[PDB]
């Protein structure tokens, strides 16, 4: 019941920050067909302390594990915030360039700017492979809320300016590559 892992890191207005010890939540679905009548094949998971590598190459084993159901293209959303997903982002373009028929939706939070002008540009190259890099949005939480939170399946809306914080961080994402 209630938000367990989402209130842990996906939150934007915590008591006093200092709460982002997580890797990244990802959902493995198909490209973007019409609304399916059944439950479809939506697999939502994370990295945890089981695999030393992020979902760069070890994530493909799940794609290989769920066989006997090939359609055409698969879409994967990646909710990341504070972890080694920077070099992972370079390896991300490697999983996206080796699959090609897969779409990548990488999300970044950061919440702590220091000096990563080339990082944002490298994400542009990972996006050229066929991925999407954008700061966490109220829509990513409203979605992850239904995917990872319970709350009886309630329509979770913005709280103390969550969408205001998602666009405030998105402005910092463009300044990471602009204002160095
Ligand atoms: Zn990663």
- CA 57 to ligand 1 centroid distance, Å: 10
Find the radius of gyration of the CA atoms of the chain: 16
Cβ neighbours of residue 25 closer than 8 Å, sequence gap 6 or more: 5, 10, 44, 45, 46, 78, 79, 144, 147, 148
- CA 136 to ligand 1 centroid distance, Å: 14
- CA 68 to ligand 1 centroid distance, Å: 27
- Residue 167 sits at φ, ψ, to 5 deg, of -75, -25
DSSP 3-state of 26: strand
The structure tokens listed for 160 are 């103390």
Residue 121: burial class (beta carbons within 10 Å; 0-12, 13-18, 19+): exposed
Q: What DSSP line would sit under 117-152, residue for residue? A: HHHHHHHHHHHHTTEEEEE--HHHHHHHHHHH--GG
Nearest to 106 by CA among 64, 59, 61, 149: 59
CB 137 within 8 A of CB 168: no
CB 106 within 8 A of CB 80: yes
- CA 37 to ligand 1 centroid distance, Å: 32
Q: What DSSP line would sit under 96-114, residue for residue? A: HHHHSSEEEEEEE-----S
Report the distance separating Cα 180 and Cα 178, nearest Å.
Answer: 6
How, if at all, do strands 74-80 and 43-45 pair? unpaired
For the chain, the distance separating the N- and C-terminal CA atoms, rounded to the nearest angstrom, is: 43
Report the distance separating Cα 82 and Cα 105, nearest Å.
Answer: 16
- H/E stretch holding 79: strand 74-80
Report the distance separating Cα 148 and Cα 68, nearest Å.
Answer: 26
- CA 154 to ligand 1 centroid distance, Å: 29
Q: What DSSP line would sit under 7-25, residue for residue? A: IIII-SS-SSS------EE
């Amino acid at each position: 019941m209630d938000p367990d892992t989402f209130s842990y890191n996906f939150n934007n207005r915590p008591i006093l920050s200092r709460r982002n010890t997580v890797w990244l939540c990802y959902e493995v679905k198909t490209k973007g067909p019409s609304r399916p009548p059944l439950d479809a094949k939506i697999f939502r998971g994370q990295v945890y302390s089981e695999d030393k590598y992020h979902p760069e190459m070890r994530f493909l084993s799940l794609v290989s594990k769920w066989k006997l159901h090939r359609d055409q293209e698969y879409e994967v959303t990646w909710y990341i915030s504070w972890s080694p997903c920077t070099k992972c982002a370079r390896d991300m373009a490697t999983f996206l360039q080796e699959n090609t028929h897969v779409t990548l939706t990488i999300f970044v939070a950061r919440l702590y700017y220091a000096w990563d002008p080339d990082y944002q540009e490298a994400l542009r190259s990972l996006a050229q492979a066929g991925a999407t890099i954008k700061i966490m949005n109220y829509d990513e939480f409203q979605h992850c809320w239904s995917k990872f939170v319970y709350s009886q399946g309630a329509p979770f809306q913005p709280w103390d300016g969550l969408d205001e914080h998602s666009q405030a961080l998105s402005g910092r994402l463009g300044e990471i590559l602009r204002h160095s």
